[PDB]
Symmetry: C2
Subunit: 101 residues, 2 copies
């Protein structure tokens, strides 16, 4: 039932379909850029040598949540503001990112 | 925290990354075949005109769970036995299947 589905979906996401990354703020951003593809947000670029690369963030992967707020429920423009806001506040950035297909 | 992650992972799986299908048993099986690709189980073939096709099962998609038992935790051989066993018992087959990339 619903309870088993909750447990299964956690196991599936956390272990197979995605991983949790943490990136500290750098000079002007978190060392990466995002773009929209289909209705999903994906990493557009990662700055070579940055803490984003160090953290394991790879170009072309979907970002499923930023600080445990799901991305698919929001317009792309709100997701960019969330990222910019997080940066202006110099907080650690927590991401759930897709693993490889 | 963990509780938000549980809620988010459910929303993500149920709404974005997968769908739940139900297939009734037919003559000799459920109208489809499976194979292993990477470490994942995928649909190898769907019988044209079958209840599997009717149900919306598509060739090449991953099957993430069969009757709410996760596939990735098991060897492929156990997954085949689970399917065969389900069929011999003539039970409805419930699948969580990947949506399109």
């Amino acid at each position: 039932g619903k309870n088993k589905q909750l447990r299964n979906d956690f196991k599936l996401v956390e272990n197979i379909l995605a991983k949790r990354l943490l990136i500290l703020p750098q000079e002007e951003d978190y060392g990466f850029d995002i773009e929209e593809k289909n209705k999903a947000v994906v990493v557009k670029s990662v700055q070579r040598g940055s803490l984003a690369e160090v953290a394991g963030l790879q170009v072309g992967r979907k970002i499923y949540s930023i600080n445990e707020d799901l991305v698919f429920l929001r317009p792309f423009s709100e997701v960019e503001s969330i990222l910019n806001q997080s940066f202006c506040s110099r907080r650690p950035l927590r991401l759930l990112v897709a693993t490889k297909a």
